RNA sequence: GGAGAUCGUGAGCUGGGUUUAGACCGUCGUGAGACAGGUCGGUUACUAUCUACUAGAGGUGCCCGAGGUCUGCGGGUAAGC
RNA sequence: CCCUAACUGGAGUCCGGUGAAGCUUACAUUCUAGUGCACAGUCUAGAGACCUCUAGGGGGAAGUGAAGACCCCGUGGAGC
RNA sequence: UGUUCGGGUCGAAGCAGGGCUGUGAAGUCCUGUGGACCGUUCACAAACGAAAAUCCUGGUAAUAGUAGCAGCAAAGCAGG
RNA sequence: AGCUUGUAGUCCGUAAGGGAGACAACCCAGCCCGUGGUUAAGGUCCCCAAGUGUCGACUAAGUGUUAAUACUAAAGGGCGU
RNA sequence: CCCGAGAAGGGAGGUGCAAAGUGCCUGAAACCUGAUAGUGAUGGAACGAUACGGCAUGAAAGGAUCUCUGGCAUGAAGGAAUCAUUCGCGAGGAUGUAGUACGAAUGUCACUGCCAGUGUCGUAUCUUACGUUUUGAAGAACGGGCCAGGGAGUGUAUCUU
């Protein structure tokens, strides 16, 4: 169970990623919304839009909208999940947006070197934030 | 190439253009609660249609005062019962029901839709609901509700339909209240609908079966030589060479009518009592004759007769208190001659 | 022509057999009522069998699918194979029968085997447009069929 | 307004033009004949195997067995100009 | 034609009987981009995609029909 | 074909499948089927080795239980 | 001009295997079979084997994350740093 | 003899060393029907090669110091770990431990009853068919639906070697 709070979206990905296909446990990350993306949030928000609005999305690409299925692609982008190791490894994976119920009070991690305060600027805006403004509601 | 544009043929907001998976419209959205307590949404079967002479009081229009003959549609509202109160938590995820009490007592052709739900927990399932609601694993609460066709007799059928609708109240706790207050309990079209007020009506349209792109979209035929060269009711082209795609935007047969479709803003002229008001002679044509309490809405409805119509509270409604129509004239000449 | 061997030989002593010699009638169709068939009790195989000849029961048609629509009921595409049904409805009165004579009880015998086999091809011409003469043939089907009175 | 999509679109249509065989006028050439000159006339083949789409079904997966009512991950919209 | 509607008979659609032919190296549920003999369902990286069946018009398969009749070449022909 | 040495109704050739050897062309053996012919040494010959020729002859698929069995021309019905 | 025509070397043509996303001719390398080890080119956040490696700075533009290649936009300007 | 409308056909029963049952010796493949093994309705495509696994088979023709699992001896190239000292701003390096323990393999001793092979499926890496025309072919360049059989440097004369 890894608090997503304050974490790097892409180095948390990868960490998690390398874990699962270490494949030894089930991750949960918690508090999806609560990543960070650095970067000017102007950037940010029209890469995010181009990317949801992009694809032949009748019978294209799909990217979603919650923050806690972004960052499930987000992963799903750093494994090989079209093999049987990269669909066992998010099949053992859970995102959630804010706490479960279930896995509230339940003991979690963080990433050291994820931590959003090794950034060097404030040119950063969270993963809450660009759902929310593509739509999402969580 | 200088093209000539023209509006794309018929609507993409309404694909895919399916069958409805129940002959019973959904809603999807409910209003703003803006008063006393009471329900959103009714259930009536529609009849027909006639037209009514009427002063018209609609303000700032150019005949407003003057005689204006307006087609009605008749719709037979039965009493509803309201079955059941069932409970909403909001969490992330969204809506989940959380709790259900039936009222003990159901009437006995029910069973045509569902096994009946025995007399069972209804004091302690309420309290449940009250704990729920106290601890604040509620985030609302709408009522089950179904209407009894068997009193009508234009209507074959005697198995009642359920839908839920909402509940219009200030606060949870005034909801809960008033849906304890009204559980088990008949409703009438007078306590969910008042004279002269805009309502939203949702219906099945008419089924048409399989169509072609020229009835089913409004594409146009093939004209002048074209006409008579083997293609005339179909559609000109399919698509581009590239894309190598026939696109789903393309008009094309298949289903046409039996959609949802909701229609806003249609006002309520009349709620009666006697069917014989609005009866004409020789009976509504396939249906017969009007018995129990009935609606007039001010122009037309989706659905044939016969459908099931949902009338719920304005979601989209521009104008304020509109008023008490004045039917001077409901026309009960033969619609058959 | 001539007299064909069995694909499968049950053991004479709880077995029946029987076989149609090469019936003009249509391999796919008699290919999907003997699947249908297979498996099926005598007299509830002739049952089913009169149902269908009487258009009260299709037969579902997995293999040769085309040209058949949907039938009411829990069923996919499927039709009434009139011909093929009499044909072998006679092959099973012919083995019901053969049981008999054996000392066998058919009405506690089950169709353990049901095939067609592609027979000898009577070769006959269709004119087509332009002075061309295209195959039309009479196909014909050798049924086999194989009762046992034990499973 | 302009432009792209095999100057989108002939297993959709048309055939007016260009691009066959006939013929006339003018100009070249002794001639046959010729002319990004003009003129009149001049056959538009196919039962869809795969894929794509539009719609309608049967299954299997999910699943105490069944039924009902809902939610909404998502998709679409010009939820009008 | 504006601008299409209804109806009639024959097909089609569904059922019984009969029963061909034409495309086919293989595989094949694809879509976008790039690459590649510079016009890819198969290569590369992504995005999608549960299977089967029925109907339907033809986007694509640079669809099928055919050793291009346009152009050139051949110390190939024919007629004039 | 000459020549040396053989095998076969106690089952030759061929055929389906398999074991072993050989880099391989291939050889040998086993099981089944088959019912009368077949190899081997050293040499010599050739109408001597096929995946391709829009190859030829024969057989046979997918297409497919599909198209067609609809302008002819009102086409049949009852009873026996 | 991925144009045309020379010249020297080397390649593809006729060149495997490893690496550059794929790449006739770009980098290592010319290659009998099997096994073990160490390297070349290139790479070491994940996809993907090995660094969320070290030191000193720059960049705020998702600029960039593109040896060569015809697969990478100029003149001019900036009290941006 | 039974079934069958039957001068069809089938079954049963015979003849014959053998059905070889009359267009009947042998009876391949394509194609078609059924059964068996594997897999299978969340799945990515030159249909394979290599390595490792699941399932099935493994009677003959293949192995019996052969297969499995270990011990011991010798072992080429290569070659640690850990710790001590020292250097470096640092990541780390050097020296010793140590050319040691190990190490392809070669022998030897126990243990074991399988292994090889075959079919199918899965995981990992690789590969865009074949022949041809081509500077360049997976080509949206040409050829083949499939299978069987047929199908192409030969003789005379003469010259040279």
């Known amino acids: 169970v890894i608090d997503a709070k304050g974490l790097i979206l892409g180095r948390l990905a990868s960490s998690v990623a390398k874990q699962l296909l270490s494949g030894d446990e089930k991750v949960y990350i918690i508090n999806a919304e609560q990543a960070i993306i650095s970067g000017s949030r102007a950037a940010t928000l029209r890469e995010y839009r181009e990317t949801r609005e992009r ?4 019978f294209g690409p799909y ?35 804010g706490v479960p119920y279930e ?36 | 190439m200088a093209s000539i544009h023209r509006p794309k043929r018929g609507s993409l907001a309404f694909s895919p253009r399916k069958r409805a998976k129940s002959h019973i419209p959904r ?25 009514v002479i009427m002063v018209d009081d609609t303000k700032n229009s150019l005949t407003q005062g003057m005689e204006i003959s307006v087609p009605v549609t008749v719709i037979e509202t039965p009493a509803i019962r309201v079955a059941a109160i069932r409970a909403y938590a909001e969490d992330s995820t969204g809506e989940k029901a959380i709790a259900e009490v039936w009222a003990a007592d159901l009437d006995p052709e029910l069973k045509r839709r569902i096994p009946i739900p025995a ?68 409703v009438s079209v007078t306590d969910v609908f008042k004279n002269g007020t805009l309502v939203d009506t949702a219906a099945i349209t008419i089924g048409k079966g399989t169509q ?3 009835k089913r979209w409004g594409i146009q035929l093939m004209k002048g030589k074209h006409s008579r060269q083997g293609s005339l009711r179909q559609v000109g082209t399919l698509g581009a060479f590239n894309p190598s795609r026939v696109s789903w935007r393309v008009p094309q047969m298949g289903q046409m009518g039996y959609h949802q479709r909701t229609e806003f803003n249609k006002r309520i002229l009349k709620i009666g009592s006697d069917g014989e008001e609005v009866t004409p002679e020789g009976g509504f044509i396939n249906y017969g004759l009007v018995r129990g309490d009935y609606i007039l809405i001010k122009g037309s409805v989706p659905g044939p007769s016969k459908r099931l119509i949902r009338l719920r509270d304005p979601i989209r409604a521009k104008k304020a208190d509109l008023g008490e129509p004045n039917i001077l004239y409901i026309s009960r000449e033969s619609k058959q001659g | 022509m001539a007299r064909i061997n069995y694909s499968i030989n049950g053991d004479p002593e709880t077995t029946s057999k029987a076989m149609g010699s090469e019936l003009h009638i249509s391999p796919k169709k008699s290919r999907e009522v003997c699947c249908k ?27 040769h699918h085309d040209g058949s629509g949907h039938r ?80």
């Open chain 2, 119 to 186: 007399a069972g927990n209804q004091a302690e399932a309420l309290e449940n609901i009250g704990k729920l609601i106290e601890e604040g694993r509620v985030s609302d609460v709408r009522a089950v509700i179904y209407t009894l066709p068997k009193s009508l007799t234009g209507v074959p059928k005697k198995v009642p339909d359920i839908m839920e609708s909402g509940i219009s109240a200030r606060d949870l706790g005034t909801k809960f209240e008033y849906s304890k207050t009204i559980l088990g309990t008949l």
């Open chain 1, 103 to 138: 896995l509230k009070g339940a003991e979690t991690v963080t990433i050291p070197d994820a931590d959003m305060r090794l950034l060097s600027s404030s040119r950063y805006v969270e993963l809450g934030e660009v759902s929310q403004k593509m739509g999402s509601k969580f």
């Open chain 1, 63 to 97: 990217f979603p909208k919650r923050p806690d299925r972004i960052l499930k692609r987000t992963i799903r982008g750093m494994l090989p999940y079209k093999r049987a190791r990269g669909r066992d490894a998010m099949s053992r994976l859970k995102v959630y947006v």
């Open chain 2, 27 to 51: 809603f999807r959205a409910w209003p703003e609660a803006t008063g006393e307590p009471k329900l959103q949404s009714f259930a009536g079967y529609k009849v027909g249609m006639t037209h």
């Open chain 1, 55 to 58: 694809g032949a999305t009748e």
């Open chain 3, 72 to 151: 009411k009921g829990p069923m996919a595409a499927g039709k009434y194979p009139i011909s093929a049904s009499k044909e072998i409805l006679k092959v099973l009165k012919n083995a019901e029968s053969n049981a008999e004579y054996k000392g066998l009880e058919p009405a506690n015998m089950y169709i353990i085997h049901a095939a067609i086999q592609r027979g000898r091809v009577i070769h006959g011409f269709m004119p087509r447009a332009r002075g061309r003469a295209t195959p039309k043939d009479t196909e014909t089907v050798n049924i086999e069929m194989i009762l046992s009175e034990v499973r």
């Open chain 2, 212 to 214: 072609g792109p020229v």
């Open chain 3, 37 to 63: 068939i297979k498996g099926m009790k005598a007299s509830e195989a002739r049952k089913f069998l009169e149902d269908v000849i009487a258009m009260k029961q299709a037969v579902p048609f997995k293999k």
